[PDB]
Design a protein around this nucleic acid. Structure first.
Ligand SMILES: Nc1ccn([C@H]2C[C@H](O)[C@@H](COP(=O)(O)OP(=O)(O)OP(=O)(O)O)O2)c(=O)n1
Ligand SMILES: [Mn+2]
Ligand SMILES: [Mn+2]
Ligand code: NA
Ligand code: NA
Length: 327
DNA sequence: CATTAGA
DNA sequence: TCTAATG
């Protein structure tokens, strides 16, 4: 966690650099297990050889570790961090919609900077066009102050459409979080559940509404169940407009909410931990359900959940408020 | 790990 | 259809 600090951390740099600059999935796969292992190891690693003992710990890596211990630096890491070709990749990539793959191509064609990206807006697709569009706004955190405002509205429209709708802004914000990055709205409805062959309009109605009143300004993607767009709070009686925000709304089979809901509310850790527990408690939990466990090894049988509670009671735990889903 | 875009 | 990018 700290004792193994630099090592894992250098390890990740190297790893990341493989998968992104190079298309070396393997090596990239190397750096990570390794980096995973030393990360677990209980003692201060003293040298190559020592590390070397570990699984995943090969000679290649060991070699690196040493140079790293001896000089608080690494050449390969020094060269990389330098290489504009690699610097560019790491950068283009920020653009929501620019993966490594594309990050490479762009460069090759000679599109290193954000300005390059604009001069060639043509070579860019809609996602990436909007991505580039709001590049600034995209990178900024969302004040909770605003979160409340946004939320306010979503709920209201949603309700204005049909009354049967159910909404929840999950994630960090849900967890009291001072700020957030994007807003996550879980959605469901009665008419919609497990079997009942969808009703695509379900998603569709709301999207239309939010555009209607001008909350949602664009569409990143709109599918039959997952919408991914951008929004913006009504730039009041001006002098101060609002930044354009990433927002995601997802339809849910009502007989699935709370699980998903529970889930998306996190935290990353609270999840596993909760997850691990339900296990001993004779169960299984995943993005949409909780199933009692059978001794044969595995079992099924999707238990009936009406709110975050049931899932609790189920694994027999303490109701933990979003606030404390911290871990 | 599953959903959408694209080509 | 596969392959990419976001989650
Ligand atoms: C997992 C964690 C969340 O439940 C969900 C993904 O939501 P985000 O990626 O937006 O993560 P957070 O809501 O935790 O972060 P924030 O809103 O601050 O971006 O999947
Ligand atoms: Mn989020
Ligand atoms: Mn999100
Ligand atoms: Na080994
Ligand atoms: Na990106």
């Amino acid at each position: 966690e700290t004792l193994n600090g630099g090592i894992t951390d250098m390890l990740t740099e190297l790893a990341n650099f493989e998968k992104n600059v190079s298309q070396a999935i393997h090596k990239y796969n190397a750096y990570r297990k390794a980096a995973s292992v030393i990360a677990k190891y209980p003692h201060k690693i003293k040298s190559g050889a020592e590390a070397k003992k570990l699984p995943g710990v090969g000679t290649k890596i060991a070699e690196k570790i040493d140079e790293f211990l001896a000089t608080g630096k690494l050449r390969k890491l020094e060269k990389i961090r330098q290489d504009d070709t690699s610097s560019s990749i790491n950068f283009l990539t920020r653009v929501s919609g620019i993966g490594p793959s594309a990050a490479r191509k762009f460069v090759d064609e000679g599109i290193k900077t954000l300005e390059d990206l604009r001069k060639n807006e043509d070579k860019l697709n809609h996602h990436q066009r909007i991505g580039l569009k709001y590049f600034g706004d995209f990178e900024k955190r969302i004040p909770r102050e605003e979160m409340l405002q946004m939320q306010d509205i979503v709920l209201n429209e949603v309700k204005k459409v049909d009354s049967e709708y159910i909404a929840t802004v999950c994630g960090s914000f849900r967890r009291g979080a001072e700020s957030s990055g994007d807003m996550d709205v879980l959605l469901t409805h009665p008419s919609f559940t497990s079997e009942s062959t969808k009703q695509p309009k379900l998603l569709h109605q709301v999207v239309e509404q939010l555009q209607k009143v001008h909350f949602i300004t664009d569409t990143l993607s709109k599918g039959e169940t997952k919408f991914m767009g951008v929004c913006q709070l009504p730039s009041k009686n001006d002098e101060k407009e609002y930044p354009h925000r990433r927002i995601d709304i997802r339809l849910i089979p009502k007989d699935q909410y709370y699980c998903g809901v529970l889930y998306f509310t996190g935290s990353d850790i609270f999840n596993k931990n909760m997850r691990a527990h339900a296990l001993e408690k004779g169960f299984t939990i995943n993005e949409y359900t909780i199933r009692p466990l059978g001794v044969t090894g595995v079992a099924g049988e999707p238990l009936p959940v009406d709110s975050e509670k049931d899932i609790f009671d189920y694994i027999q735990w303490k109701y933990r408020e979003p606030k404390d889903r911290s871990e």
